[PDB]
């Protein structure tokens, strides 16, 4: 005959943002040098 009223509640939760990324690239530039440290005719005496 005794009806008791009760109130229930569950705990809340917490989320968080995040990200993923594959490997990254970057540019590059090269110029080949053309040095010619060469004389005309060295008179050798080997």
């Amino acid at each position: 005959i005794r009806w008791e009223t009760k109130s229930c509640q569950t705990a809340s939760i917490a989320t968080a943002s995040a990200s993923a990324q594959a490997r990254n690239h970057v540019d590059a530039q090269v110029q080949t040098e053309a040095p010619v440290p060469v004389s005309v005719q060295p008179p050798s005496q080997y």
Partner: protein
């Protein structure tokens, strides 16, 4: 660039908006993580959280989504997966 939708379980309005949002994201950002972030954030605002977005040229996925909130499409050679879950 040209948008091609391959799969969708999504209303026509969200489909077109997803493309438009991804299109702007791809114009604005070069890095996939930032492209995804733009697309995700815009959807949470317009269509309520919680959306997730994956952007890339090479991947496989296995995900669980809410009904009527999933699309997979290309912009050129870049695939975009967008869905709601949570």
């Amino acid at each position: 660039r040209k948008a091609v939708i391959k799969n969708a379980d999504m209303s026509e309005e969200m489909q077109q908006d997803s493309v438009e949002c991804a299109t702007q994201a791809l114009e604005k950002y070069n890095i996939e993580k930032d492209i995804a972030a733009h697309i995700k954030k815009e959807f949470d605002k317009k269509y309520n959280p919680t959306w997730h977005c994956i952007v890339g040229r090479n991947f496989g996925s296995y995900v669980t989504h809410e009904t009527k909130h999933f699309i997979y499409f290309y912009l050129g050679q870049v695939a975009i997966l967008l869905f709601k879950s949570g």
